[PDB]
Design a protein around this nucleic acid. Structure first.
Lengths: 131, 85, 57, 64, 164, 92
RNA sequence: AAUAAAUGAUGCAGACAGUACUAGAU
RNA sequence: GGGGAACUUGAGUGCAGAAGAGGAGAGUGGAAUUCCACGUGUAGCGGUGAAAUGCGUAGAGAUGUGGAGGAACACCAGUGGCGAAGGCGACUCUCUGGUCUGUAACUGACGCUGAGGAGCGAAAGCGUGGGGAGCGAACAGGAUUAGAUACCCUGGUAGUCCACGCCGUAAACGAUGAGUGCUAAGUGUUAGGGGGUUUCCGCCCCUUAGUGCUGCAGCUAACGCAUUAAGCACUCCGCCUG
């Protein structure tokens, strides 16, 4: 069942951050790979790798702690839940903490962040926030 | 036991090793429900067996709905073969 | 009652010494002494889990 | 302590074993506890079954 | 790190609650003092004190607050981003405001924000109105704030890369 | 598989005991219950007293039937005075 | 020739007010 | 989201095993209580804080034998086990439900929840016909108290039991809805599996589902919870607004 893979992915990442872990294993769907690569290019993660196996495929995430003891991903939160979908327009694209954070948004042309969607003049599902 | 199942399997086997066979599971559930009602017609107070029969019937109904949504031809064939009316 | 085993060539209290010790391994002190007044099934069941574990007896 | 059935690798008690049932039952007739006999839970349950069947078949007493 | 108390401070009390202890003889009354000490350059702290006298309790609370100072970002005389504190059933949100809005908050939160040097903040309490918990939640929310340059250094990016 | 053990009253001659044994065996075979095994412990002292005797003859029989000759044997032993106690168990 | 530590179940005690009562300031 | 085509991890079938107070039905059992009959046998028996009501010289209690009948199943027995919940504890048998272990052979999303509805549903209670050993509301008597329509004692109806039907309520509680995923540890325990020497007995490690205690982070008003959450998240249902 599980009703959604993305929310559980985000919560697993949040628990990993809370415990100060260094690795994770996820069934690694296409959208999950996309979000992980976005976080990678955003500096939230040290490195990410894909493991295409026979069962479904697996992805490993390496949490980032650039300094002595600091959680890069302080918190996460999903919005477009399965039962209350959220769609934001180009003019209503939000910004996380005055542009300090980042929010993932699937748009008409690929999956992009808030700033990328604002630049490209698009909009769609606001499926997650990041702080 | 170990005879009715084997016969139903050999009868409803579409392939050499087809044992998932929603039709086979339906036939097995039907024969089990019949054997259960046989004794429930006398031990009317065994409510736990009635709950088990309700569970089996729910499984049967879900399988029948799946088969109807998947292949109406095979659904109607199973109907004509078993008489599950 | 301790047992049917007989002992002789001792004192009067030497027999009671072993009586009071061997009577422990028989229901004469528990089975025949608890059922003087009724105990509800709930408390009846909880009494075992309490005594046989806490080792109060 | 050490269990008997495990040490012997034996199978179903075969209640006919009157001597075994006797030496495993108290001198009075009451069933000895597991903490004293050293047996496992499964073997203790089988022991209870066997001793009950024996008492039913006059192979062991009820009162002594 | 711990901030040194060697600075000019505008120590200002909030409330003085009178508590009583019951004894064979009767009730023994003591005074509890809440005080907020800080400067208007981004450093503030909270302390408390108890004694049978008002001035002694005030002095003890001031001395304790001196040892519990904390730093707060002052991006544009305001906070870099909104945040909420949730210390002990006390929920208080803090939003950044323009240059002419002013400090808007209930007594204790307003005092804490003023003594910290912030002039334009939007606040709203959404929980208990107890002053201790109010101050604690405000302090927690201010501690959980992050600077733009700090976040840029942490995420291995440039300030402009984040602000645009 | 099934097992059957019963007790015969002691005050019975050898010929009468054998006749009773054959009678009950025929009763069991009324449906075709093959007798896969037999054992006679003999004279054993009962742990406790019964109707009129302290000892008796123990008889063991292995059977593989359809649970009908079992009921026949049961109702016959409960009625007949030759047998005192009896129990049927599955050898599974 | 020696020599044992026990045993325990206590009967009775109902009510008390309507209105009353201490503070403290950088 | 709809339609089309593939996949197994979800889901289910089979394969070889495992435990269990799982249920309905039939038979059996020996302790123990009561009564009856008889042999021995006298002045008491039973009971309370004390006492009395009660039974006993038409021969009690006790002791020994036999019979009659009815309920429950000592020791095993252990936060042990099963069941969706209530609940389930002697033995034998007929008919039956679910669960766990390696599943990989099989179908390949067939899954979760579920208003309304149906069914089940402690004890008590009601109706029909039986049965009634002990216990025992109501009731009678004897005590205490100022009073006792009670707490104590002696008797004692219905009830407790059996077949059918009805009622559908409990502190029916873990005062914690169902499903899934993630989140340090030590620790016993039930039924299994694999292994590192041993044929073993047994020691250790690993791995499944369940049952218990102490405890990190985290949560919480605190109490406390903490891989069986009251932690971190998603889906559905019922409920709350002095």
């Amino acid at each position: 069942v599980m009703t959604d893979p993305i929310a559980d992915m985000l919560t697993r990442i949040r628990n990993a951050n809370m415990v100060r872990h260094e690795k994770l294993e996820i069934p690694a769907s296409k959208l999950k790979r996309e979000i992980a690569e976005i976080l990678k290019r955003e500096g939230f993660i040290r490195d990410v790798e894909f493991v295409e196996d026979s069962k479904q495929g697996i992805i490993r995430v390496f949490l980032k702690y650039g300094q002595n003891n600091e959680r890069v991903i302080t918190g996460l939160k999903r919005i477009s839940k399965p039962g209350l979908r959220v769609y934001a327009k180009s003019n209503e694209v939000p910004r996380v903490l005055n542009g300090l954070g980042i929010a993932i948004i699937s748009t008409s042309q690929g999956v992009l962040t808030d700033k990328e969607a604002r630049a490209k003049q698009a909009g769609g599902e606001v499926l997650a926030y990041v702080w | 036991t170990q005879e009715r199942k084997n016969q139903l399997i050999n009868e409803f086997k579409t392939h050499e090793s087809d044992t998932g066979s929603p039709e086979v599971q339906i036939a097995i559930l039907t024969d089990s429900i019949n054997n259960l009602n046989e004794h429930l017609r006398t031990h009317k107070k065994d409510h736990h067996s009635r709950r088990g029969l309700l569970k089996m019937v729910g499984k049967r109904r879900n399988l029948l709905t799946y088969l109807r949504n998947k292949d109406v031809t095979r659904y109607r064939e199973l109907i004509n073969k078993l008489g599950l009316r | 009652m301790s047992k049917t085993v007989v002992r002789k060539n001792e004192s009067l209290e030497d027999a009671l010494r072993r009586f009071k010790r061997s009577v422990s391994k028989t229901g004469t002190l528990a089975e025949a002494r608890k059922r003087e007044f009724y105990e509800k099934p709930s408390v009846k069941r909880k009494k075992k889990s309490e005594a046989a574990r806490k080792r109060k007896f | 302590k050490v269990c008997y059935f495990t040490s012997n690798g034996i199978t179903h008690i075969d209640y006919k074993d009157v001597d075994l049932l006797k030496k495993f039952v108290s001198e009075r007739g009451k069933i000895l506890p597991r903490r004293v006999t050293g047996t496992n839970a499964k073997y203790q349950r089988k022991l209870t079954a066997a001793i009950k069947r024996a008492r039913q078949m006059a192979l062991l007493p009820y009162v002594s | 790190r711990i901030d040194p108390s060697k600075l000019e401070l505008e120590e200002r009390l909030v409330t003085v609650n009178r508590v009583a202890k019951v004894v064979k003889g009767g009730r023994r009354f003591r005074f509890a003092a809440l005080v907020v000490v800080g400067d208007k350059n981004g450093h503030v702290g909270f302390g408390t004190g108890k004694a049978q006298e008002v001035p002694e309790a005030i002095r003890k609370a001031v001395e304790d607050a001196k040892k519990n100072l904390i730093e707060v970002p002052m991006v544009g005389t305001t906070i870099p981003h909104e945040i909420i504190g949730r210390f002990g059933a006390g929920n208080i949100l803090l939003k950044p405001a323009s240059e002419g809005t002013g400090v808007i908050a209930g007594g204790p939160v307003r005092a804490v924000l003023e003594l910290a040097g912030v002039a334009d903040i939007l606040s709203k309490s959404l929980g208990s109105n107890t002053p201790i918990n109010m101050i604690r939640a405000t302090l927690q929310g201010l501690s959980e704030l992050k600077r733009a340059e700090d976040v840029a250094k942490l995420r291995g990016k440039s300030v402009e890369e984040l602000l645009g | 598989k099934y097992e059957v053990m019963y007790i015969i009253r002691p005050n019975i001659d050898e010929e009468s005991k054998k006749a009773v044994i054959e009678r009950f065996n025929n009763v069991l075979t009324s449906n075709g219950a093959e007798i896969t095994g037999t054992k006679d412990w003999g004279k054993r002292r009962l742990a406790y007293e019964i109707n009129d005797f302290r000892d008796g003859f123990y008889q063991i029989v292995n059977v593989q039937s359809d649970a009908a000759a079992v009921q026949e044997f049961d109702r016959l032993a409960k009625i007949s005075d030759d047998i005192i106690r009896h129990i049927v168990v599955k050898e599974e």
